[PDB]
Symmetry: C2
Subunit: 291 residues, 2 copies
């Protein structure tokens, strides 16, 4: 058994041939322009023709996916995949068994299978980069929700909502690495495209007041979301991943900030398998489905 795995990202499509124990024996990546579903389907077709010994296909996809039927009801950034049965498409194209699961869920499944969540029944995964991702593991099972939408952690309010559209008051729009860069551009007058997260943190470490405020507010927003999650789900562990891991000391920094809030026994630590989690979790889902 050799499984063709696909992980549909924000800017790249990752692909691999994976053995049932998580050994990835071949990889391929492609930059994808403007999250164009047709380009993604084309890259898939090309990878499959190149790898004729695969016996199964496993997909990690953005948006909302019925994991049994393969119907993507909302394709995340990929409008082409709205109301698209990608499982049935791939089955028709190849004659191979296919499984599909949401991207955040797949990364959580990687954590459960091969990472730090192997023996945990109640943990969350929180991903912080350009946006916010979430996955929920409760009672030893993924929580997908009634319409496969669960885990939208970025939609939590970080402040009392005002009169602009509600999204503006949510973590997705207040508390991300992108928002930090946007704010720094506004405060300094410099072009966004020339600002890095690394420089903001470097300025922070050099006690720059503007940077201090930006980072302080960022951590407060993260703490707001963590407090909500802790009280709602009562996980034992929250694994934090994404672009934020570009800050080496971020877990220690969050714990410090959390002294004003209270972790309340919850363990916070980094997620594992940053590079391959989507592929590996897609495989885990596929392996569960084959049984």
């Amino acid at each position: 058994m050799k499984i063709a795995a696909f992980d549909i990202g924000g800017t790249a499509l990752k692909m691999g041939v994976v053995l049932p124990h998580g050994e990835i024996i071949l990889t391929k990546s492609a930059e994808i322009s403007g999250s164009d579903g047709d380009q993604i389907l084309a890259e898939m077709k090309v990878f499959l023709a190149e790898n004729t010994d695969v016996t199964g296909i496993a997909v990690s996809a953005p948006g909302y996916v019925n994991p049994k039927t393969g119907l993507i009801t909302m394709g995340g950034a990929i409008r082409r995949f709205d109301n698209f049965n990608l499982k049935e498409w791939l089955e028709a194209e190849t004659g191979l068994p296919v499984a599909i699961e949401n991207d955040a869920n797949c990364a959580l499944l990687a954590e459960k299978w091969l990472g730090k969540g192997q023996d945990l029944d109640d943990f969350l995964c929180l991903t912080i980069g350009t946006g916010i991702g979430g996955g929920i593991f409760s009672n030893g099972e993924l929580v997908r929700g009634g319409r496969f939408r669960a885990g939208e952690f970025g939609y939590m309010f970080s402040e009392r909502p005002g009169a602009f559209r509600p999204g503006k008051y949510t973590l997705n729009e207040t508390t991300t690495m992108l928002v930090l860069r946007r704010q720094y551009a506004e405060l300094t007058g410099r072009p966004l495209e020339e600002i890095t997260g690394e420089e903001i943190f470097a300025n922070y470490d050099a006690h720059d007041a503007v940077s201090e405020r930006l980072i302080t507010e960022f951590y407060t927003g993260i703490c707001t979301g963590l407090y909500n999650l802790i009280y709602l789900f009562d996980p034992t562990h929250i694994f934090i991943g994404g672009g934020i891991t570009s800050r080496p000391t971020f877990i220690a920094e969050l714990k410090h900030h959390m002294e004003s809030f209270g972790l309340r026994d919850t363990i916070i630590e980094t997620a594992t398998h940053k590079n391959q989690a989507g592929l590996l979790g897609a495989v885990y889902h596929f392996l569960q489905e084959e049984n």
Copy 2:
């Protein structure tokens, strides 16, 4: 089989003899002073001696309860029940099988057993009165959490947390029937003890500006919590109960307010069995445990 059921409330202890199909053939209630655990234990002993044909005991208790062992790790308002195994106490006192579950969880279980959640795998219960309660049903199972703490909906932030203790910025302290009365007392200068929720709503319906603001802010806080819950859990239904049901049109009023937020397919409606939900859910848990 006749089950002695106990539901430990904020100001009353409800008691009943319940048949396995939810017919409650006898009831008794006692006002409890200052949530005194010893008084509760005394009332239990008296009810049991009065009802010698009971064959089992089912408890709905505040705080955090290990439902298999019966250990109450934190007794809610009842300090006497902190780190107290109420299951083992009752077993030793009576020789009868005993089950125990948290109060919010029991009320949700009543909804699942006999109410509006019978055929639902993903729903929440939100209780709004003097404080806020929560119960979570995901993947066809109660979510209790890693330490039996899950469902603390009142700890969600309704605004960006400030520098006072975090609780002050949570639904428990910003968005309750008690907070409404407190605010009305502050705004009018009248004593809290002389203010009713009913008068605030009556003044609201008569277009009193002060009342309008209080009610508007209350509904915004509820909408903040509902939006968070909807995105996190993706329930099909959220059942809302508690003191707030003293407002006959509150569901219609919340739906109206939610037009600025978006229910996103979620059905909101009132919880059922307001009077007996704790008793009935305690029984359901007991019946599950006996198998």
